[PDB]
Amino acid sequence: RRVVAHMPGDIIIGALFSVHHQPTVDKVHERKCGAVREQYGIQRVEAMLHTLERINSDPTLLPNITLGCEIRDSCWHSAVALEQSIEFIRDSLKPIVGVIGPGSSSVAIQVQNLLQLFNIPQIAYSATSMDLSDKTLFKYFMRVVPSDAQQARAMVDIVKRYNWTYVSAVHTEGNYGESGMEAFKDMSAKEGICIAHSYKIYSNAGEQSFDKLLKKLTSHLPKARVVACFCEGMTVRGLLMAMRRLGLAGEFLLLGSDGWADRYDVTDGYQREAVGGITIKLQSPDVKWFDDYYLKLRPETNLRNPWFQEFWQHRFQCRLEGFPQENSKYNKTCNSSLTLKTHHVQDSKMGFVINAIYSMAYGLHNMQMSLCPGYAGLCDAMKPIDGRKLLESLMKTAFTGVSGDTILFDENGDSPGRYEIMNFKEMGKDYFDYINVGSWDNGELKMDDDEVWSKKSNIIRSVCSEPCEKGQIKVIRKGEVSCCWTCTPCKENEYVFDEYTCKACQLGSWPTDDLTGCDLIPVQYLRWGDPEPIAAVVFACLGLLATLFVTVVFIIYRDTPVVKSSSRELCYIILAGICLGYLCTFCLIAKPKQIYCYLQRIGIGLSPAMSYSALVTKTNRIARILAGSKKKICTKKPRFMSACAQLVIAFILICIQLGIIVALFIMEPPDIMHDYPSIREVYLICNTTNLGVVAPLGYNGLLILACTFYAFKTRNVPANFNEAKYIAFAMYTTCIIWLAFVPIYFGSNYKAITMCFSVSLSATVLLGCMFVPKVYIILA
Amino acid sequence: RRVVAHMPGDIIIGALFSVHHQPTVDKVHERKCGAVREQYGIQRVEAMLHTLERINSDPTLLPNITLGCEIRDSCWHSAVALEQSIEFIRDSLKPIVGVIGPGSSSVAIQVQNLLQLFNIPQIAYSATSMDLSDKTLFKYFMRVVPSDAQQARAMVDIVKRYNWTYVSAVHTEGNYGESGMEAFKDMSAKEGICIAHSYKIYSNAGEQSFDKLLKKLTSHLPKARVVACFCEGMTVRGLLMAMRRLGLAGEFLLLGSDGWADRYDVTDGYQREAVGGITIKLQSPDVKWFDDYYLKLRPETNLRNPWFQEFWQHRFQCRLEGFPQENSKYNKTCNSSLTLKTHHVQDSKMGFVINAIYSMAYGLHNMQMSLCPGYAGLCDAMKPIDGRKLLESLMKTAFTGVSGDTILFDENGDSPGRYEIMNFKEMGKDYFDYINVGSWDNGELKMDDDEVWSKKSNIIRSVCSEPCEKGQIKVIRKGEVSCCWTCTPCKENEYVFDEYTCKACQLGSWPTDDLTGCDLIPVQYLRWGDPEPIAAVVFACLGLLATLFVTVVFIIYRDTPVVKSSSRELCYIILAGICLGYLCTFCLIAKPKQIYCYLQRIGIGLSPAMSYSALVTKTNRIARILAGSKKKICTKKPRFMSACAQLVIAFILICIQLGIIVALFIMEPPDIMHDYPSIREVYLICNTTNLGVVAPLGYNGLLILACTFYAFKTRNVPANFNEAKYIAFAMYTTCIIWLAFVPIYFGSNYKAITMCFSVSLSATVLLGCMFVPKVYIILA
Ligand SMILES: C[C@@H](NC(=O)c1ccc(C#Cc2cccc(F)c2)cn1)C(C)(C)O
Ligand SMILES: C[C@@H](NC(=O)c1ccc(C#Cc2cccc(F)c2)cn1)C(C)(C)O
Ligand SMILES: *[C@@H]1O[C@H](CO)[C@@H](O)[C@H](O)[C@H]1NC(C)=O
Ligand SMILES: *[C@@H]1O[C@H](CO)[C@@H](O)[C@H](O)[C@H]1NC(C)=O
Ligand SMILES: N[C@@H](Cn1oc(=O)[nH]c1=O)C(=O)O
Ligand SMILES: N[C@@H](Cn1oc(=O)[nH]c1=O)C(=O)O
């Protein structure tokens, strides 16, 4: 059988403290537990044994009745604790009216499942998992500490404050670890946090298991540099030992939990691997009277604690010769100068144990007051202490704890509590310590980012991918966790609306500077100004000046003998054609509008006919004068009427041209098209079809052929300075110029400027080859 | 307080059967159980009570000693079962040497946690969770059924066989449901399957909880029509009741598990909502000798079963007034005419219970034979039966079960087993039943897809997205479950490398049909055929005919005064230049090849330059001999240069042209560029560049300018048939022929046909306007 601590009293209160370490992986079946514990063992045992004495001494609490205890060792194991609980309830098969629950959540659950069948309230001081908050399954369970829902919140707040996204999760196999990690995973995946992989491991696992776990952790080392540990102290210690073994000294950031807290026994010897790690600790002020009592304990006088001799020998490596527990393993003896003061560290969860004991005592006191207000002691209506009544009294009892605050239980049996954020840092040389760097209280996460990471240099944030949101590059997530993405540029034609997809502008638009919204690229027109249009306007102006000068000379030299052979009316039509051609370019080089491109077409059509048809009829006559004279045998042939015939021949040729232009205008009406050659640029012009520029042009070319043919007939006939010869050069040059612009026209969409220049050149060639004699011959 | 079945014996075997239903959500704390169960209760109790008597009667098994029992009710609850186990082990604090474990996995775990402390082996018949396979925590636990890993595999196989990807998961709160659903999730999400959402719910949850669960399930109804239920019978029944209540009668296909199997008590009354459900059932042949004992049981004679009278009154709604149990609740009495034969259904797992009891008996037999081979009975070395020895003997025992096969335990305490796939179908009008449609045995899923869905119009597949392998249209996953994707068509330019990306080919290439891969664009070279090149070569042939005709006429009249005006050798290299220019056409329009690639270049370089050189060297003399004649003061220097030096002064600068063209040539070898004008088409051309084409052209232009200047010097001069004027006009028109094609060349693609036309035009205009006149009347 196992040894237990005893204390006589009227009412007996059970206890389950992990005096010894958890059984090793190979000694589980034998249910033998390992070395003695100081913080979790002897300290808590002494704390209870002294708190009971304090309660007994106090008259204002539980008067006239003394409180006893039966403290048993759980060895931090479910199997051992269940055995001890069976020993507790053996009498029910002095009764145990209540127990101070074990530290572990899984162990607490196992013990509660047995205790609830006998109506024995259980108060825990460190059991934290959310699973114990279910009063349907755990009616007789209370704790003086909050659930680990708040702890998971605090951890999520920590990971979100430092912009850690691609973290890794490790938790101890059990109930505390499982519940904690589930809650953390939920609240982390909710906001924006992603887990590379979740790993689980027993505390008492071998070296090989921890090595494999750390290899798996390092499999994501370059990216996931922060590990979320909902792990016990032994799990963290095993991780540190693995880090030491395989040569990791600070490329992980361990985010601890309540299990780690500020325990010095999890980092002793392996400090350098755990430096920089952040842990969450339940806030509990150090108890002073407990220290005053504890630091004066000696093995010689302290008999009521059965494990104290073993602990004394284990702490100061020595053998106590005078007592049965010699443990001759240790070499040296224990001199009478060893004190517990040296290297004394009180456990963090010391206030909670005293608070739990006080809560049980106050519950009993309240129930005793409520049952028999008159009698001072154990009234007859209590001797069979009813578990249900005690539970009901405990669920509503309130008192002032050792810390100074008021302790009360909510509907779920929990108690209010706040957390302290501690960062493991190196103070000096070969001197590490836990430093308080923040707190968490009902949602607010106060922190001190100056103490943690002295320099802005903060542990490379656990990010699965660098921010791809810079410019045109777009985010594409693969068939993996939706926190890292491939960063790809989508073509500049497109713009990014969603971070994960981009679309292009329809036909005539472009993305803005920010690549959020098309900008409808500006339309380019012919634009008065620009070198080539200015040259066109200059040429048009000079041409118009020449035309008006020639017209002036003609309307001054009306009926001069020299100008009598040519048809005066027909020459008027010639000048009209030339002037209209010169006006056509002025109309054409401009902003396209309905009004402008209504009459640019009639210009380009009518002018080269209104001149060239009249030239045809003029040359025809001047040939008929000579061609008819070749025979000179007998010709009563006034077939063609001097001018009468010539003018109507004109007014029919020009009118058929006008008819064809009007038809081509009617069937194809002019609109202001916004033709899009490329996605880059947008132009606007009036709709021209192939027909609209090939039919009138073809007809004009036919007139060119007619004039040239007739000019070749007449060639070098003696005339007034041989004007027919001038017509010869006129038509030769006109045909050459017409043939010259074919490539540039049917090559570049430079339709407008080439058309303008062609019309101007054709006009100036006539205005030159003709009238040149008329300007200086008559000048003579 | 709770009743117990008894049977006297030397060795007592415990049992835990769920005789009554699970305590209701209100009465959990009072641990008062529900109504009686037939399949899971009385039938199993009677099975044990009869199989023990069969074993006792058998002389070849457990000889000379009797086997007793102590059957207790667990009410399918962990709290009640723990109390009953405490009652079991109270004697250890006649001992119970071992128990036949409870049906539920969680309940089995709770019972085992207590039993392993007292070395009491536990054999389960329906516990299936994987958690019980861990011998570290459950050393004294064995099962005659396989773990639920195989069950999860079977379910994954079922969902894989029917294209189901986007399913929803439900599991019962507990250990069986949790382990099953975790295993299923792992092996489903691993391979190809998707889960819309995983839901958990307690079996004894209220109507409201089931309503909320079904609302959440319907929230994904259009896409996820298959529900994977790793749920108990009561959970499935609750789901069916919810479906009936909110009028959901065929939307879902429930995929059951061992909990459902082919139980008629989970679908009775609510058949119409469960039709078309597929369930997995552990194969176990019906035990024939059990029926012949069970069907003859009557309440009057069966006194050894404490629950039999209550069950009799519950099954046939009647009050057995005669007996202590009357339960007035049932109005009518029962005549002595009701038999268990009517509506008799033996449960699926009757074979497993009998096999477990036989396993325990055979274990005891083997251990007895090993301990004392000589004595037949309870030898003195066996009075304190050791649990460890019994466990060791049980872990290696093998025997023949009721079915006929051999029952043995592996290292983990499990047993081999095969699964049977059952389908809930409507056979006839007002008739439903389970139909065996498949099996699963060590990864082999033999199904019959004809009995289920007797057509091709099966259940709408639980798929989130239709197969989007439609040509290009890639898949884009939107952060949620891979399963659900949008469809974007990817650009013609590019093709699909994988399902999730589309990349473009090289600078010159096209994706093949159905965008599968990539191909090479055929090179469409400038064919010897085609519309334009045939005209070009016709023109070249006519030009060459002109050259040979002119050369012939020159050879006919060599020393005639009408020809002997200038150096006849100059008007030999003129024709040489013309011929070479015409040959440039033939050496240009062809397949771009190494040889032709320099031939064309040397042609275009030398020929026009060398022709115009000789024209220059003729015209300077013909101008200067009369330029000096204009003044003629003395000018008695007939030589100057003149004489036959003309040929030398032409040839030196022709060699200069050859030198410069060789200079351009040495930089660029006659290779072929694969010019890419657009993404769609690929062309090939010679290695000519801007620098390699603009220098010889520029030099030739300089010669053109020089010759034009000299032609302007001469123009109209009286000589033999007036050569100068015609050649001057020829050069004038040539100057602008050289300029017409410039825009459509330097920046174009058809720069071969343009060259072909330009050289021919320049050749005809230079020949037809230089020699033609001289040879027009060459006859005279
Ligand atoms: C560019 C194109 N040219 C023309 O489409 C065109 C149209 C009209 C004229 C003219 C004229 C003219 C002539 C004399 C007097 C006058 F007022 C006007 C020239 N070219 C082609 C034929 C390819 O060269
Ligand atoms: C098409 C192109 N023209 C030429 O690159 C080119 C090169 C050579 C000639 C010639 C010639 C010729 C002239 C007389 C006799 C003879 F044998 C050959 C014309 N154009 C550009 C510059 C755009 O005008
Ligand atoms: C974390 O949050 C954002 C991430 O860019 C940034 O504004 C902030 O400075 C980061 N760092 C800290 C210490 O908050
Ligand atoms: C989907 O099911 C069909 C038959 O129901 C069959 O082609 C195969 O099992 C599945 N399809 C594929 C592509 O595997
Ligand atoms: N809340 C923790 C308590 N605790 O865990 C440890 O590892 N030490 C310790 O005190 C748990 O539920 O286990
Ligand atoms: N397979 C279940 C057992 N079981 O659940 C039911 O609903 N019926 C039944 O036999 C388990 O492993 O706990």
JSON list of N, CA, C and O in Angstrom, two decimals, chain A residues 7-13 66 68 70 87-88 90-92 94-97 378:
[
{"chain": "A", "resi": 7, "resn": "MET", "atom": "N", "xyz": [-4.28, 13.67, 9.79]},
{"chain": "A", "resi": 7, "resn": "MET", "atom": "CA", "xyz": [-4.50, 14.74, 10.75]},
{"chain": "A", "resi": 7, "resn": "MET", "atom": "C", "xyz": [-5.85, 14.52, 11.43]},
{"chain": "A", "resi": 7, "resn": "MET", "atom": "O", "xyz": [-6.88, 14.56, 10.76]},
{"chain": "A", "resi": 8, "resn": "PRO", "atom": "N", "xyz": [-5.89, 14.29, 12.76]},
{"chain": "A", "resi": 8, "resn": "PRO", "atom": "CA", "xyz": [-7.16, 14.12, 13.47]},
{"chain": "A", "resi": 8, "resn": "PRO", "atom": "C", "xyz": [-8.03, 15.37, 13.39]},
{"chain": "A", "resi": 8, "resn": "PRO", "atom": "O", "xyz": [-7.52, 16.49, 13.35]},
{"chain": "A", "resi": 9, "resn": "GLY", "atom": "N", "xyz": [-9.35, 15.15, 13.36]},
{"chain": "A", "resi": 9, "resn": "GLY", "atom": "CA", "xyz": [-10.32, 16.24, 13.35]},
{"chain": "A", "resi": 9, "resn": "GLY", "atom": "C", "xyz": [-11.75, 15.71, 13.25]},
{"chain": "A", "resi": 9, "resn": "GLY", "atom": "O", "xyz": [-11.96, 14.52, 12.99]},
{"chain": "A", "resi": 10, "resn": "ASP", "atom": "N", "xyz": [-12.72, 16.60, 13.45]},
{"chain": "A", "resi": 10, "resn": "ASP", "atom": "CA", "xyz": [-14.12, 16.24, 13.43]},
{"chain": "A", "resi": 10, "resn": "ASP", "atom": "C", "xyz": [-14.55, 15.93, 12.00]},
{"chain": "A", "resi": 10, "resn": "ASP", "atom": "O", "xyz": [-15.30, 14.99, 11.77]},
{"chain": "A", "resi": 11, "resn": "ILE", "atom": "N", "xyz": [-14.08, 16.75, 11.06]},
{"chain": "A", "resi": 11, "resn": "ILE", "atom": "CA", "xyz": [-14.41, 16.60, 9.65]},
{"chain": "A", "resi": 11, "resn": "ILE", "atom": "C", "xyz": [-13.12, 16.36, 8.87]},
{"chain": "A", "resi": 11, "resn": "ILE", "atom": "O", "xyz": [-12.15, 17.10, 9.03]},
{"chain": "A", "resi": 12, "resn": "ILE", "atom": "N", "xyz": [-13.13, 15.32, 8.02]},
{"chain": "A", "resi": 12, "resn": "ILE", "atom": "CA", "xyz": [-11.96, 14.93, 7.26]},
{"chain": "A", "resi": 12, "resn": "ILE", "atom": "C", "xyz": [-12.11, 15.38, 5.81]},
{"chain": "A", "resi": 12, "resn": "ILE", "atom": "O", "xyz": [-13.15, 15.16, 5.20]},
{"chain": "A", "resi": 13, "resn": "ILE", "atom": "N", "xyz": [-11.07, 16.03, 5.29]},
{"chain": "A", "resi": 13, "resn": "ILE", "atom": "CA", "xyz": [-11.04, 16.53, 3.93]},
{"chain": "A", "resi": 13, "resn": "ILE", "atom": "C", "xyz": [-9.92, 15.81, 3.19]},
{"chain": "A", "resi": 13, "resn": "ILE", "atom": "O", "xyz": [-8.77, 15.87, 3.61]},
{"chain": "A", "resi": 66, "resn": "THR", "atom": "N", "xyz": [-12.90, 20.86, 14.86]},
{"chain": "A", "resi": 66, "resn": "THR", "atom": "CA", "xyz": [-11.57, 20.78, 14.29]},
{"chain": "A", "resi": 66, "resn": "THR", "atom": "C", "xyz": [-11.64, 20.07, 12.94]},
{"chain": "A", "resi": 66, "resn": "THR", "atom": "O", "xyz": [-12.46, 19.18, 12.74]},
{"chain": "A", "resi": 68, "resn": "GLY", "atom": "N", "xyz": [-9.82, 17.84, 9.95]},
{"chain": "A", "resi": 68, "resn": "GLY", "atom": "CA", "xyz": [-8.80, 16.84, 9.66]},
{"chain": "A", "resi": 68, "resn": "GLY", "atom": "C", "xyz": [-8.60, 16.69, 8.15]},
{"chain": "A", "resi": 68, "resn": "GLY", "atom": "O", "xyz": [-9.33, 17.28, 7.36]},
{"chain": "A", "resi": 70, "resn": "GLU", "atom": "N", "xyz": [-6.76, 13.77, 4.96]},
{"chain": "A", "resi": 70, "resn": "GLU", "atom": "CA", "xyz": [-6.13, 12.53, 4.55]},
{"chain": "A", "resi": 70, "resn": "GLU", "atom": "C", "xyz": [-5.51, 12.76, 3.18]},
{"chain": "A", "resi": 70, "resn": "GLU", "atom": "O", "xyz": [-6.19, 12.62, 2.16]},
{"chain": "A", "resi": 87, "resn": "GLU", "atom": "N", "xyz": [-9.59, 4.20, -2.24]},
{"chain": "A", "resi": 87, "resn": "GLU", "atom": "CA", "xyz": [-9.24, 4.19, -0.83]},
{"chain": "A", "resi": 87, "resn": "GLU", "atom": "C", "xyz": [-10.02, 5.26, -0.07]},
{"chain": "A", "resi": 87, "resn": "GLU", "atom": "O", "xyz": [-10.39, 5.06, 1.08]},
{"chain": "A", "resi": 88, "resn": "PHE", "atom": "N", "xyz": [-10.27, 6.40, -0.73]},
{"chain": "A", "resi": 88, "resn": "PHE", "atom": "CA", "xyz": [-11.04, 7.48, -0.13]},
{"chain": "A", "resi": 88, "resn": "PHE", "atom": "C", "xyz": [-12.47, 7.03, 0.15]},
{"chain": "A", "resi": 88, "resn": "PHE", "atom": "O", "xyz": [-12.99, 7.27, 1.24]},
{"chain": "A", "resi": 90, "resn": "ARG", "atom": "N", "xyz": [-13.67, 4.05, 0.41]},
{"chain": "A", "resi": 90, "resn": "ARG", "atom": "CA", "xyz": [-13.74, 2.69, 0.94]},
{"chain": "A", "resi": 90, "resn": "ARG", "atom": "C", "xyz": [-14.73, 2.64, 2.11]},
{"chain": "A", "resi": 90, "resn": "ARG", "atom": "O", "xyz": [-15.44, 1.65, 2.27]},
{"chain": "A", "resi": 91, "resn": "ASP", "atom": "N", "xyz": [-14.74, 3.69, 2.93]},
{"chain": "A", "resi": 91, "resn": "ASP", "atom": "CA", "xyz": [-15.60, 3.74, 4.10]},
{"chain": "A", "resi": 91, "resn": "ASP", "atom": "C", "xyz": [-17.07, 3.75, 3.68]},
{"chain": "A", "resi": 91, "resn": "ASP", "atom": "O", "xyz": [-17.90, 3.12, 4.33]},
{"chain": "A", "resi": 92, "resn": "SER", "atom": "N", "xyz": [-17.38, 4.45, 2.58]},
{"chain": "A", "resi": 92, "resn": "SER", "atom": "CA", "xyz": [-18.75, 4.59, 2.10]},
{"chain": "A", "resi": 92, "resn": "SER", "atom": "C", "xyz": [-19.29, 3.28, 1.53]},
{"chain": "A", "resi": 92, "resn": "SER", "atom": "O", "xyz": [-20.50, 3.17, 1.32]},
{"chain": "A", "resi": 94, "resn": "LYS", "atom": "N", "xyz": [-13.80, 7.41, 9.37]},
{"chain": "A", "resi": 94, "resn": "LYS", "atom": "CA", "xyz": [-14.58, 8.68, 9.23]},
{"chain": "A", "resi": 94, "resn": "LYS", "atom": "C", "xyz": [-14.73, 9.02, 7.75]},
{"chain": "A", "resi": 94, "resn": "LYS", "atom": "O", "xyz": [-13.76, 8.94, 7.00]},
{"chain": "A", "resi": 95, "resn": "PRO", "atom": "N", "xyz": [-15.93, 9.43, 7.30]},
{"chain": "A", "resi": 95, "resn": "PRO", "atom": "CA", "xyz": [-16.17, 9.68, 5.88]},
{"chain": "A", "resi": 95, "resn": "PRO", "atom": "C", "xyz": [-15.42, 10.91, 5.37]},
{"chain": "A", "resi": 95, "resn": "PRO", "atom": "O", "xyz": [-15.16, 11.84, 6.13]},
{"chain": "A", "resi": 96, "resn": "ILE", "atom": "N", "xyz": [-15.05, 10.87, 4.09]},
{"chain": "A", "resi": 96, "resn": "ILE", "atom": "CA", "xyz": [-14.40, 12.00, 3.44]},
{"chain": "A", "resi": 96, "resn": "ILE", "atom": "C", "xyz": [-15.49, 12.88, 2.84]},
{"chain": "A", "resi": 96, "resn": "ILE", "atom": "O", "xyz": [-16.18, 12.45, 1.92]},
{"chain": "A", "resi": 97, "resn": "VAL", "atom": "N", "xyz": [-15.64, 14.10, 3.36]},
{"chain": "A", "resi": 97, "resn": "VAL", "atom": "CA", "xyz": [-16.75, 14.96, 2.98]},
{"chain": "A", "resi": 97, "resn": "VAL", "atom": "C", "xyz": [-16.41, 15.73, 1.71]},
{"chain": "A", "resi": 97, "resn": "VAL", "atom": "O", "xyz": [-17.31, 16.30, 1.09]},
{"chain": "A", "resi": 378, "resn": "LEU", "atom": "N", "xyz": [-21.15, 20.66, 15.93]},
{"chain": "A", "resi": 378, "resn": "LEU", "atom": "CA", "xyz": [-21.76, 19.67, 15.05]},
{"chain": "A", "resi": 378, "resn": "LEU", "atom": "C", "xyz": [-23.13, 19.29, 15.59]},
{"chain": "A", "resi": 378, "resn": "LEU", "atom": "O", "xyz": [-23.22, 18.45, 16.48]}
]
